[PDB]
Amino acid sequence: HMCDAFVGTWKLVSSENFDDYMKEVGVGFATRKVAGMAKPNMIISVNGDVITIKSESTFKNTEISFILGQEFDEVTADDRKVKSTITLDGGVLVHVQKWDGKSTTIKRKREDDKLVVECVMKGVTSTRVYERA
Ligand SMILES: O=C(O)[C@H]1CCCc2ccc(-c3ccc(Cl)cc3)cc21
């Protein structure tokens, strides 16, 4: 019953400060513009210990499967090759990506009927809010 409250199909309804977060990460102009337009569908499922997050959009489709606490290699939508670790901390999924001596953290939280995603790179935060599809 791990991650029960995250499981489902979610749709992005708002994004704040995402272009600035992507600049802080190092994403180039053309990818920022096309990526920032996307309104993805995030599909979260659990099978035993394995959590899968599948995200579908006009920009990119991605899929990650993982076990909490167990590092995995991820190719992000902006083509970074990162080493990722996802843990549960006080009911928040905390996803750390490491590449080229850099780090970014993505937190996914259940708040009311929404799933709230906070992406942090150094001092820059972006918030992306999802509703049930
Ligand atoms: O979330 C995902 O799985 C993907 C697929 C669905 C759409 C989308 C949009 C933008 C970015 C994205 C872009 C730039 C940066 Cl730095 C990080 C993430 C990542 C994604």
Side-chain angles (χ1 to χ4, degrees):
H1 289 268
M2 74 151 203
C3 300
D4 274 357
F6 293 99
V7 164
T9 301
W10 299 93
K11 64 189 169 75
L12 182 73
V13 299
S14 68
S15 179
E16 284 285 1
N17 215 43
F18 191 60
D19 193 66
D20 285 352
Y21 168 77
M22 290 189 287
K23 284 187 177 179
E24 204 70 8
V25 170
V27 186
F29 182 90
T31 299
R32 291 199 314 278
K33 297 304 160 208
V34 173
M37 291 290 297
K39 299 281 188 155
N41 181 183
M42 191 181 35
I43 307 108
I44 302 175
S45 63
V46 182
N47 184 326
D49 291 340
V50 183
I51 304 164
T52 300
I53 303 178
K54 281 188 60 163
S55 307
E56 312 222 295
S57 75
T58 64
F59 164 58
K60 230 90 233 194
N61 304 318
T62 64
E63 177 183 332
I64 61 171
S65 294
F66 55 93
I67 296 172
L68 297 171
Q70 301 195 4
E71 190 171 68
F72 60 99
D73 282 315
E74 180 179 7
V75 177
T76 66
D78 62 308
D79 287 315
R80 286 173 288 125
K81 285 47 160 190
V82 312
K83 297 282 180 176
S84 289
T85 309
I86 303 179
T87 56
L88 212 33
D89 168 26
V92 177
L93 282 170
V94 180
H95 178 178
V96 185
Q97 296 176 332
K98 301 296 194 183
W99 78 106
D100 296 343
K102 301 174 195 168
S103 188
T104 187
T105 297
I106 304 161
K107 291 184 181 181
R108 296 171 177 99
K109 305 178 176 180
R110 264 300 299 279
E111 203 166 284
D112 302 318
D113 289 318
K114 294 177 186 170
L115 188 172
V116 176
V117 183
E118 297 165 352
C119 299
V120 175
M121 180 61 186
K122 295 188 277 170
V124 179
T125 309
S126 168
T127 300
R128 288 161 69 88
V129 178
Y130 295 75
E131 298 192 341
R132 299 273 189 182

